[PDB]
């Protein structure tokens, strides 16, 4: 019997708008630790892991594990029914074809019941190993979103290089080149605007910009973004979803042919 | 070696927010007096001349006179990367296949180092002479954007008649007629909101509203616009860009 109450309501909306176009069907794996999600794109290039912990919910109780197939377009329309300050209570049965979301006003005046029909999907739980990264860079969310939004105009790819000066985002397209540098910032009045870089070895990898533009719609979830980059390791984009969980992305880098000219 | 540095970055954005829609491509000619742009549209009707002097740039260096052909739609995506208070510096070599634009943040957190490819083009110098205009109107620029966008729906052509009672903008079409009158305003708190009309002879002329709507994208360049019109010379729309340059639109008359 899946009852799960969430007081801050628009954070689930921002979680969904991060998954809005990047993925169309996904499976929710439900345990006593909480809500888990692991999916891939239709192109099988980008991996999305979403974890919502048990203690972040207001009243969470769950007797048995639930594998639950979801079309994110249907509840993309259904979570647009939710308000920004509304309380969201999720309810499902052990053998449900149904999903119930109740949207409650903060003054307990407006009550909303919404139903979604579920679909069966085959689940391949791809167990992500714990790997140490050569480079870990934490930077503002709006800054990274602006970085991909400017560099997607020049070309379709970015070359991201982490070295001792800092992090460099490069693009090369038919309009010309583009090279934006970021250095480690010693002193900011707030901890959410600083760029802080931890390193073992300088790395350099190329990434598609459609995927990063899809990734950086998760900007209002967290004020800081952790990019973990290394050689032979995917580009990990960790958003810490407050104290209730984390949203993690995995991008395979592109193939760069080596030319002597 | 050409190197021009500009502190108020957004004015170049205001400058090319309206140039990406009129002319798809443009020539910058560089001399020790400064940087000029005299260009024509594809259909031989509207001319633009933009002058940015060397005094209004804090660092200006022009060793030799240069001609660079810039695609004005390949540059606007190098333009939308700008912040509003960014510092813009432009460099090019004496044998420049490229054009470098370097941005810094107001707090200088990021250093952008864009570099676009130049282009080769047929070059013509069309010397505009010095002539007296029968009617000169100094008018607010935000109102000029408003008047052009409001007779945008009425028709496809405009008729301006400047006479002793003031200036009159008329548009006609299937939805009817839109006629407006602006008079010499006497007492305004600010000089930018005033209208100043200098007249020799009443002048009535006709032009196209699509190009006028293209002209009025330069409303954040200046708070005032000069309209200079006479019997046979084309209509002049003048935006005095800060204290450091001017932008100059010539629109040829329609035929009646």
């Amino acid at each position: 019997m899946f009852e799960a109450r969430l007081v801050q309501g628009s954070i689930l909306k921002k979680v969904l708008e991060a998954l809005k176009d990047l993925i169309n069907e996904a499976c929710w794996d439900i345990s006593s630790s909480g809500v888990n999600l692991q999916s891939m794109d239709s192109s099988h290039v980008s991996l999305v892991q979403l974890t919502l912990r048990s203690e972040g919910f207001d009243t969470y109780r769950c007797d048995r594990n639930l594998a639950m197939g979801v079309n994110l377009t249907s509840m993309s329309k259904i979570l647009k029914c939710a308000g920004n300050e509304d309380i969201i209570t999720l309810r499902a049965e052990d053998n449900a074809d149904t999903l119930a979301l109740v949207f409650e006003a903060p003054n307990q005046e407006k009550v909303s019941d919404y139903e979604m029909k579920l679909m069966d999907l085959d689940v391949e739980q791809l167990g992500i190993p714990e790997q140490e990264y050569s480079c870990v860079v934490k930077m503002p969310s709006g800054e990274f979103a602006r970085i991909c939004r400017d560099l997607s105009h020049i070309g379709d790819a970015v070359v991201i290089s982490c070295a001792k000066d800092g992090v460099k985002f490069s693009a090369s397209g038919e309009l010309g080149n583009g090279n934006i540098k970021l250095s480690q910032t010693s002193n900011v009045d707030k901890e959410e605007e600083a760029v802080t870089i931890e390193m073992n070895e300088p790395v350099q990898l190329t990434f598609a910009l459609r995927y990063l533009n899809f990734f950086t719609k998760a900007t209002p979830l967290s004020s800081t973004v952790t990019l973990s980059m290394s050689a032979d390791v995917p580009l990990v984009v960790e958003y810490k979803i407050a104290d209730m969980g984390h949203l993690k992305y995995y991008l395979a880098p592109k193939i760069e042919d080596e030319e002597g000219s | 070696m050409f190197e021009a540095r500009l502190v108020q970055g957004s004015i170049l954005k205001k400058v090319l927010e309206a140039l990406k829609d009129l002319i798809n491509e443009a020539c910058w000619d560089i001399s020790s007096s400064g940087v000029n742009l005299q260009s024509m549209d594809s259909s031989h009707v509207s001319l633009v001349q933009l002058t940015l002097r060397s005094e209004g740039f804090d660092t200006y260096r022009c060793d030799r006179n240069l001609a660079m052909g810039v695609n004005l739609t390949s540059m606007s995506k190098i333009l939308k990367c700008a912040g509003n208070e960014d510092i813009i510096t432009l460099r090019a070599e004496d044998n420049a296949d490229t054009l470098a634009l370097v941005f810094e943040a107001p707090n200088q957190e990021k250093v952008s180092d864009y570099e676009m490819k130049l282009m080769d083009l047929d070059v013509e110098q069309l010397g505009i002479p010095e002539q007296e205009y029968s009617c000169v109107v100094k008018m607010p620029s935000g109102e000029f954007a408003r008047i052009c966008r409001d007779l945008s729906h009425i028709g496809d052509a405009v008729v301006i008649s400047c006479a002793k009672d003031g200036v009159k903008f008329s548009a006609s079409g299937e939805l009817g007629n839109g006629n407006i009158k602006l008079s010499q305003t006497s007492n305004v708190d600010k000089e930018e909101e005033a209208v100043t009309i200098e007249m020799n002879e009443p002048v009535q002329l006709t032009f196209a509203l699509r190009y006028l709507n293209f002209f009025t994208k330069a409303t954040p360049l200046s708070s005032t616009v000069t309209l200079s019109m006479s019997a046979d010379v084309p209509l002049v729309v003048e935006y005095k860009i800060a204290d450091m340059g001017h932008l100059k639109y010539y629109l040829a008359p329609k035929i009646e």
Binding site: - | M40, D41, S42, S43, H44, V45, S46, L47, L126, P129, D156, A157, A208, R210, D232, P234, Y250, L251, A252, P253, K254, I255
Partner: protein, 99 residues
Amino acid sequence: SQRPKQKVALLCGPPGLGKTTLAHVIARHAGYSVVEMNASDDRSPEVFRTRIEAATQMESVLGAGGKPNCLVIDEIDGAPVAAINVLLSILNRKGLLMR
């Protein structure tokens, strides 16, 4: 209204004879500044409409008149039918086509 009864020319034939060369040198012979057009390059009705009332229906910006322009449309054999419809509606108007 002093226009010819044949408003628009429709020279046709096989490739590579010199129709464009003949049209260019005749336009340069008859005191016209040449201006070109590819039709299916910009195949929407609106851009064709803008160029069809911009290349014609206008004076010249240079000096004391200068020289006028005559529109030379190439490759309208493969133009979409809305473009020829816009050209016909601008030809059959009785604000008036002059070039």
